[PDB]
Amino acid sequence: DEQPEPRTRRRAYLWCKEFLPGAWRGLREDEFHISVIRGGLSNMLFQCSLPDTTATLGDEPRKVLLRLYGAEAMVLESVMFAILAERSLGPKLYGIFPQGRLEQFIPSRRLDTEELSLPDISAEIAEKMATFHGMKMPFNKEPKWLFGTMEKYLKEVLRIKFTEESRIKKLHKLLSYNLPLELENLRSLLESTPSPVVFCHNDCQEGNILLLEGRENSEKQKLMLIDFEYSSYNYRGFDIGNHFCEWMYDYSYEKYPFFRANIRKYPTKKQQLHFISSYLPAFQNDFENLSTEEKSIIKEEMLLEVNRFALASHFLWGLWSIVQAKISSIEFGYMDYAQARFDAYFHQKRKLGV
Amino acid sequence: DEQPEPRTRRRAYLWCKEFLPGAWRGLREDEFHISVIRGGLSNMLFQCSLPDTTATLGDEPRKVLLRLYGAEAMVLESVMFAILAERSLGPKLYGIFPQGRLEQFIPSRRLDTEELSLPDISAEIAEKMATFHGMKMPFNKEPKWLFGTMEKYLKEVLRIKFTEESRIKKLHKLLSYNLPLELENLRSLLESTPSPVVFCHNDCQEGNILLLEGRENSEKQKLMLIDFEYSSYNYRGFDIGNHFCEWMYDYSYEKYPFFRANIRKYPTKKQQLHFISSYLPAFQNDFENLSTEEKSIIKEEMLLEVNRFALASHFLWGLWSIVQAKISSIEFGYMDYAQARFDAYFHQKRKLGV
């Protein structure tokens, strides 16, 4: 039950006392409870609560989450969060300030990688993503995010000068593929792959899906998608393809390189069909009322769409991870992860016949 | 029908084409229509529209408002605007970017000063303000805004060194009252005046109230309150008192000092009672079900509350206007307006016996 630094405790007390109504407003510092949920250098998370012996005066929360950012993007992220809260699609927003946010506390745990393949879990994720994709949001709707970001990362990657031997070697191998040309071949494939532009999460992995406390044995409505900070208008195929890729990566491994990758855990076509069978009628209202024939065509075209876009998940996050090897202050086997994504990229490309 | 600068036209075209869906996305520059609604140095407003010969593809707007800011506050204002849009309490928000916003276009005109006293108009304003005051918003709830802002302004005002003769003279007269002491006497009065802390508009004047096109002959729901940028948690008495003060000031006068002030146009007690009779049951659900006796007590206490807080509208905006005389690039008789507010302050104080 980790306690924050006295400085952080006092700042948290003041934020809660000033931004939250009812019993919070008259709270004494020596009555304030706070514990560290997640440490680190950025997005530190704390649980803040009233004393058990303090009654609420109205409908103020008894417990809240404090997010500290640490050490235009701010405007967009804050507006998006506020909008998703209003629409009941994310945690409520209780307070916003230069240093962080006070959010609704949602009793829950995160999903584990293996849970992504449970049929009921996968069905709900599909429904939740289809819902998220229907959001109208006040952001640029031109789908420049995917290749814009890949181009940016590629430029950064080409110019990295490592000083450490193993990183120099792994980088040389990764750049030996001719990434500018390969990126262009990917662009060509994806340009011939129709995929609607929708508000995408862009990071639908197990670590960003809450299993809601007390709902674990309920068939539906037991999940919440969170951590929208990378969301943007983007190709629908990317969001689904990226999710499918996440079946293969477990980030909870406690030893170096602090992840495991398993190509054999990518969803089978049967599993993908189960997922898209839940996605489609959640995204397109009267989908169920189409002929078995037209449903099957729509499903077949979507399978090809999402599996082609899955290549962009590998390519983008592969480049991303090389960049983190250069710039990150967090411990993780970034170069080995990069190699794993590019290995998966070529394996997938082969299976596609592309 | 004023046209913007070619540079502004092109930027507006690009914002509309990228942030708005359907027919907007394929629009050609030579088809784009834009006209200036309001010029100036900051918050320039433009109307943007599709050609009459272009059909919409879905439910995209045919016409929008572009606001350009010109030359933490940004985060808070943008979040507030997004939240009020979600709740149907302001215009929809279609796009947000560093330079401005794309908003819903609301066919309307602003109210004139004399229209504030029409019984049906005043009743609706009361209902709209009571609604606004029920908003829960993710902002600091400590009511430091009123005297915080007055202290800030007073400090600035004391140190102004004008070079122009008439401004030097008018300032000396305004500071002759001993404003630090008078501010403290006001604080003392208001500390003894209970007033709930609510989300306040802080600027409920005729220029910020839309009369909705086609609703002009409807008894109810013909107005919208807009221009929330000065909104904050604050004493309810201030928002209502400030509105009452606005009955006296007409900002449409075309000759120097570009406003008229008339002490005799302040609402009578009968008129104030009509306003609060609409406010209370809009703010407190089952108010109508209280005894005539308890309703009358609540009305009497509110009359005293709002009329005491009206003194703070005079004092705050009086100081504000002195500051604008020093710093503003807009033409207006700021020193004469300041004198008018302080004249009203003392007149009101006398009538209160305070």
Ligand SMILES: CN(C)c1cc[n+](Cc2ccc(CCc3ccccc3)cc2)cc1
């Ligand atoms: C920026 N963005 C939306 C993404 C970046 C990377 N990825 C893939 C990914 C996800 C998680 C990780 C693990 C991060 C981590 C680092 C240190 C300890 C534990 C986890 C690595 C790569 C998906 C989306």
Ligand SMILES: CN(C)c1cc[n+](Cc2ccc(CCc3ccccc3)cc2)cc1
């Ligand atoms: C910052 N704030 C919420 C306020 C500031 C001033 N006032 C009173 C007020 C309102 C309008 C004006 C007129 C502004 C104006 C300036 C030049 C041309 C036309 C109007 C002056 C004073 C109310 C609220």
